[PDB]
């Protein structure tokens, strides 16, 4: 009936004024965030980088969880103004609704960016763990093959029927390895597939060369061929030596 | 007295021939390795990269430990040929000596490259562990300062002498934080020094910006100033409100 009802109607005005402040605020804080969340900056990234992202994404997710409160306040005020029949309620309700709707999407997008990151980290991690292996087992292998190429081509010096008869032996014990060793040589090859394959699964533009190993798998086969090709040339020479110790 | 002594003298010839083979081999394997070991490819590297190096340096150190044997064989033969007075012994001895001398240096260099790497890894690691921290504690901070800038600027709506008398309170309980909170704000600043300092210790051409945090320390101070500058503007407004609740 005036005054006492006027003050009561001005409160409502004050409330909305309180509503526009907070709304205005939140609206400016959520500007562009969507675009920032729908961005694709991790498809080429490294295990390192991606790990940087999850870390910065936790920052963003902490800023987020903080504003959940501002959003409920905004909603509460628009709710009161609707119930007290503020005269411009459809408008404030609409601004509040457009805000709350956006909130739900930020939620989705955000959870989405985390999932794309947590999986890019696993691919990247996985790839790494393969590479490491390849190199771990590929080093000893490179060794053995060098320790065999030089051995199978080592000039011998025998002047008895018995010296040349221990070599033919030691060298016979080494062949029994050729197979088993070729078992390992199969594996290394395998590990090399599991990598180029996983890489090939997602983005095929990433590099395959192993940053942990210089011996590549190509050159690792080349060596094995020579190892295989020497085995026979040795046999001959060792035969021919026997054919001189029992020949004198 | 011929023949039986001839065969004995031909053995020596055969032995040296055996010596030139192995020498020739080792010599070609150690070509350029020195240069490869005196190279400086880690001063700009990342924690990641360097870690790649130690891994490839273990490969090189495994190839090394393997040839120690070839070196002792070479030495043994030159030793025999000296004792049996081979006629070209000074020469083989000299080739063996030049090889053994090189071996000792590869040893030094190699141990040296490992040490430069193990320490570059620690600097790099260290830097990283600092950066992480800065960002870890710098995120919550950024929050609080936003959660305070918006609070100290939040329009109030009171119509009694008691409502405006709880705010003045809640807001009085918040100030007791300003100091302690400034304690944290000091720390974050510190962690930020420990990094730029360590970085500045070795190579000063590396970047300082934190890959784990977007909030820089500069902009982190800017916010604290506003937080400090609002505290007073609030006081006023809250005073003036009391000067209207006890004024009506």
């Amino acid at each position: 009936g005036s005054s006492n009802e006027i003050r009561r109607l001005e409160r409502l005005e004050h409330l909305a004024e309180k509503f526009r402040q907070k709304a205005s605020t939140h609206e400016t804080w959520a500007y562009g965030k969507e675009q920032i969340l729908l961005q694709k900056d991790y498809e080429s990234a490294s295990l390192t980088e991606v790990r940087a992202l999850l870390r910065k994404h936790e920052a963003f997710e902490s800023d987020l969880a903080a504003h959940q409160d501002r959003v409920e306040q905004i909603a509460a005020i628009a709710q009161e103004l609707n119930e007290l029949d503020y005269h411009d309620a459809v408008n404030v309700n609409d601004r509040c609704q457009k805000i709350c709707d956006q909130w739900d999407r930020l939620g989705t997008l955000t959870q989405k960016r985390r999932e794309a990151l947590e999986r890019m980290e696993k691919l990247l991690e996985t790839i790494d763990q393969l590479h490491l292996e390849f190199a771990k087992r590929a080093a000893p292998f490179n060794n053995w093959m060098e320790g065999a190429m030089e051995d199978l081509q080592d000039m011998f010096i025998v002047h008895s029927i018995e010296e040349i008869q221990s070599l033919i032996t030691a060298h016979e014990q080494f062949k029994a390895t050729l197979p088993e060793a070729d078992g390992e040589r199969q594996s290394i090859m395998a590990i090399q597939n599991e990598v180029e394959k996983v890489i090939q699964s997602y983005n095929i533009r990433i590099s395959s060369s192993n940053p942990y190993s210089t011996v590549t798998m190509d050159e690792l086969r080349t060596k094995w061929d020579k190892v295989k090709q020497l085995v026979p040339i040795r046999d001959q020479s060792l035969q021919e030596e026997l054919a001189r110790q029992h020949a004198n």
Side-chain angles (χ1 to χ4, degrees), chain A:
Chain A
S2 184
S3 206
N4 220 65
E5 160 78 353
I6 284 174
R7 267 192 296 294
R8 204 264 306 177
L9 284 162
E10 280 165 349
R11 179 176 163 269
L12 296 192
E13 274 303 350
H14 291 162
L15 225 25
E17 299 180 299
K18 181 182 192 184
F19 171 89
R20 285 138 195 168
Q21 189 189 82
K22 311 186 78 56
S24 280
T25 301
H26 185 96
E27 289 158 311
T28 71
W29 162 103
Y31 189 46
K33 286 210 167 294
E34 334 185 2
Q35 291 56 58
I36 290 165
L37 280 182
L38 287 132
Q39 178 175 59
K40 282 282 186 55
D41 44 271
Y42 55 98
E43 302 178 302
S44 54
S46 57
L47 180 44
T48 335
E49 304 182 62
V50 170
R51 292 203 156 112
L53 303 178
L54 301 144
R55 244 58 181 60
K56 284 182 163 188
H57 196 72
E58 290 175 60
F60 181 111
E61 277 185 309
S62 61
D63 177 53
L64 197 57
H67 299 286
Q68 173 66 40
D69 207 292
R70 285 80 184 69
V71 177
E72 299 182 0
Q73 288 174 51
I74 279 172
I77 307 178
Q79 206 196 308
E80 167 157 46
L81 278 172
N82 279 151
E83 296 170 344
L84 309 196
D85 248 76
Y86 180 53
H87 70 96
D88 190 51
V90 182
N91 207 283
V92 303
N93 173 267
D94 190 75
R95 180 117 100 88
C96 178
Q97 187 76 229
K98 191 191 71 175
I99 281 185
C100 291
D101 290 326
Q102 169 174 69
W103 190 243
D104 294 320
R105 290 154 55 217
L106 292 191
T108 299
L109 296 188
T110 292
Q111 180 193 307
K112 239 57 187 182
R113 180 177 176 72
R114 164 168 242 69
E115 280 157 29
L117 294 180
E118 284 178 296
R119 81 154 47 83
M120 179 60 152
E121 199 209 305
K122 190 175 179 184
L123 273 175
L124 255 12
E125 169 71 299
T126 285
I127 282 133
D128 189 82
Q129 217 71 183
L130 287 179
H131 274 154
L132 213 174
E133 269 227 297
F134 174 86
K136 176 284 185 56
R137 296 209 300 150
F141 201 59
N142 198 196
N143 293 162
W144 182 100
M145 292 207 266
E146 307 286 345
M149 292 180 270
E150 174 175 37
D151 285 42
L152 305 168
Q153 299 175 70
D154 262 302
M155 183 180 285
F156 40 62
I157 292 176
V158 297
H159 23 57
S160 82
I161 67 179
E162 177 179 80
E163 310 174 322
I164 210 289
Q165 193 178 303
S166 299
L167 294 198
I168 214 71
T169 289
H171 170 300
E172 215 67 64
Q173 297 198 319
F174 158 73
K175 282 186 62 181
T177 304
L178 270 70
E180 193 159 303
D182 183 40
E184 159 89 18
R185 177 234 181 197
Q186 288 184 58
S187 291
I188 304 313
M189 298 196 102
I191 282 172
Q192 179 59 46
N193 335 170
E194 231 305 60
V195 191
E196 303 186 304
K197 179 175 180 175
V198 170
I199 296 179
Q200 170 279 349
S201 82
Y202 201 66
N203 161 51
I204 76 165
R205 287 166 169 175
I206 298 170
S207 175
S208 301
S209 58
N210 191 322
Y212 301 25
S213 199
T214 44
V215 172
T216 80
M217 175 53 93
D218 161 66
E219 47 187 38
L220 190 152
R221 185 159 180 169
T222 289
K223 292 180 177 160
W224 169 266
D225 284 334
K226 316 317 173 179
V227 177
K228 183 178 182 179
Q229 155 215 304
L230 294 196
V231 195
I233 310 188
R234 180 65 166 198
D235 310 333
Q236 194 100 58
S237 301
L238 273 188
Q239 300 213 305
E240 298 153 322
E241 250 310 300
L242 201 67
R244 279 260 293 182
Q245 297 304 296
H246 277 185
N248 286 68

